[PDB]
Structures are given as C-alpha cells and as structure tokens.
Amino acid sequence: DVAGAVIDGAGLGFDVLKTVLEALGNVKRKIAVGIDNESGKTWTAMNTYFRSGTSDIVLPHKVAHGKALLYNGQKNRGPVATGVVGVIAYSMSDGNTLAVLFSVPYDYNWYSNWWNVRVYKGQKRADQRMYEELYYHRSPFRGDNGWHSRGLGYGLKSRGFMNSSGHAILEIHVTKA
Template sequence: MGARQSVIHITNKTEGYTLQNPSLHLVSGLCQIPLPTKLGPSECGSALFSKTGGTARGSVGVFTYDLYDTAADRADKKIAVLFSVPFDYGLYSNWCAVGVFDGETNSDSALYHKMYRTPERGFVRGKADGYDLTHTDFNVTIKSSMTNFSVATLKVEVHIK
C-alpha cells in the first residue's frame, strides 16, 4: 500500500504575532520530525508525520499553536490544523481543516472529532485536492492546501486579515 505520510509546511506571514507552544494529538501514526516550537513573523518550518509500520492505519492528527500577540503580550487565540492521510483509499480520502479557536482549546480527541466530523463553526474543512481552504476569524486568516497523495504535502499560511 505504500507510505502514508503528512509533510506539513507552516509559514507565519503575520507581523506582530508569533506561533508558539505547539500541541499535537495523533489519532494514528507517529511523529518523525516534530513541529517547530516557535515561528516568529515571516518564519516558516516543517514537520513530518507517518503511519506506524506494520499497521493498517494512516497518518492522522490535529495540532494547535498559541497565537501570541507580541504587542499585547498575550495569546488569546489558537490556530488549529487537522490532517488525515488514511491507510485505505477505498474507504477514505485525504482531508484537512484549519481554524481559529479560543486560547483554552486543547489539542485532543475532542478537537479532532469537532474538526473532522461536526458542522464547520470556527474552522473550514475539505478534501485534499490541491486547492486552497481559507478561514478568517479574529483578525487572522489561515490558508491551507493539501495534495491528494499517499505522501501528502499540507501547506499552512497564517496572515493578518
């Protein structure tokens, strides 16, 4: 069946905001290259998640970053990103979702369930087809695009609206 990987590229295209304190919840798979711990304005970074060898599961999870406002010296909001690269393409497809949540939101199974299964409130979700998903909330716009391959590339950009 081949590799099931999520290569994630994150770019902070804001001025005055830092993405920090990443938190990850994996539903399946493992982390091969961890999320950057901090992305200041105009910085970018990458992470790699893969299926666990010998299992019939893919690479699936959700992560958050605190959206730290340097001028206000606080992080009232979080950005969240969901990625799903399944093992069985006969039953599932690649999906991604991005959103802005309050600062108390945890990266856990509840957030994963919300972003994968419930109606879109505070986030946008879509099948991976290479086209952009865009979500604007607070004063932040998150753009994402994901390829529909077993080694999927998910690009995430955070902008000021």
C-alpha cells in the same frame, strides 16, 4: 529545510514539502506539513494529538511572524492498515490557539485526504475532542489538489493546499484578514 525547523515564510513551497517527504523514506503513508506564519504574532508550540500514526519530530517550538514551520508525520510502522491523522496546536501571543487538522487514510478506495485550520479562543491543547470538532463539525477541506481559503476570525485568514495521495503535502499560510 528539515522537519522540526523554521524557514523564512517566503521559502515555503511544494518543493520544500517534497524534500520533507523524501527524508522519511520508503513508507506507505506520510505527510509533510508547512505552515507559514504571517499573522503578526509569535506562535509557541503546544502539542500534536495523533488519532493514528506518529512523528519523530518535535514541533518547532517558536514560530515568529515571517517564518514557516516544517513538520511531518507517518503511519504507525508495521502490518497495520492505518494512515496518519492528527491535530497540531500552537498558542499565539494574542492568547488564542491555532489548530491544524491533517488526515491521510490507508484505504483510498473508501476514504480521502482532509485538512482543516481553526483559531480557538484561549489556550486549548490538541486532543481527541478537538479532532472530532475539526473533522466532523467544522467543515474540513478535502486534500483535492486545490487551494482553499477561509477567514479564521480574530483578524486572520487561512489559505492552504493539500494533495490527494498517501504521500501528502499540506501547505498552509496564515495571514492578516
């Protein structure tokens, strides 16, 4: 139940994600991400792109059907008024790419949490262009303490939940449509 590990998919829940948050300690902005793979395919880590912030965790390399990966991120350490924003990319054994955006801002006077999930045709690494697509162009979900569902095409669908504060949990389930 640590970031960088995989757990049985059925075990994923907000308690495990709070555990992940608690392990990062006293930092101002941080995120715990759990993504439950119920897609019928194996996922292999590609990379994480950070627009800002960092993780000390390696993406779980192999995520079999029926497993959830756990991951985390935090703001850059130090007197920088910035949050943690980035895109995770996994390659799926059908030849496509699962991409996940998470965005936790510094200033909640003016900005809000967001996330997004998309499947890309072919093998595509996470990068600043992918961030811009996920954030500006592909209808991200607000981290509004609510669940959101969307078909992903490719026979899959996504259902996820993110809270609205600067200690963020993001729980996503990828299932057969």
